[PDB]
């Protein structure tokens, strides 16, 4: 339970960082 | 409290995928 | 461990809100 929830939070954190960088790319063209 | 944390993570994973797809759309016009 | 999970989720929810606001500003503004 705990370990699966921690994995899902880490995957969201990684997606979170990738979407931030992608939104920054789109702002600059 | 644990169940609520999981329902909140599930809503956030759905919002995460929604933002990812909208960013993909914006990227292409 | 509990506090760290709750903190990560609040930070992700907050980042989710910041990223949606930037996306709306880029798409429409
Ligand atoms: Cl359920
Ligand atoms: Cl998120
Ligand atoms: Na509980
Ligand atoms: Na632990
Ligand atoms: Zn559970
Ligand atoms: Zn920016
Ligand atoms: Zn793509
Ligand atoms: Zn493409
Ligand atoms: Zn932990
Ligand atoms: Zn997010």
* Ligand index nearest the alpha carbon of residue C25: 6
From residue A18, alpha-carbon distances to A3, B2, B4, B7, C1 in Å are: 23, 28, 26, 23, 25
Distance CA C9, CA B17 (A): 16
- Is there a contact between A27 and C26 if contact means CB atoms under 8 Å apart? yes
Q: What is the tally of structural domains in chain B? A: 1
- Cβ proximity of C16 and A17 under 8 Å: no
Record the resolution, in angstroms.
1.9
Q: Cα A1–A7–B22 angle (5° rounding)?
A: 120
Q: Which two tokens stand for residue C10?
A: 């609040």
Return the closest-CA partner of residue C21 out of A15, B19, B26: B19
Q: In terms of residue numbers, what domain contains A11?
A: 1-29
Distance CA B23, CA B25 (A): 5
Taking the CA atoms of C17, C22, C26 and C29 in sequence, report the sign of the dihedral they define. Answer: positive
- Is there a contact between A6 and C9 if contact means CB atoms under 8 Å apart? no
Name subunits touching A (3+ CB pairs < 8 A).
B, C
Residues within 5 A (CB) of ion ligand 3: B 1-2
Distance CA A24, CA C19 (A): 10
Q: Which residues lie closer than 8 Å to B11 by C-beta, 6 or more apart?
A: none
User: What residues in A contact C16, CB-CB < 8 Å?
Assistant: 16
Distance CA C16, CA C10 (A): 10
- Cβ proximity of C22 and A27 under 8 Å: yes
């Amino acid at each position: 339970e705990w370990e699966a929830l921690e994995k899902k939070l880490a995957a969201l954190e990684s997606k979170x960082q990738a979407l931030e960088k992608k939104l920054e790319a789109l702002e600059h063209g």
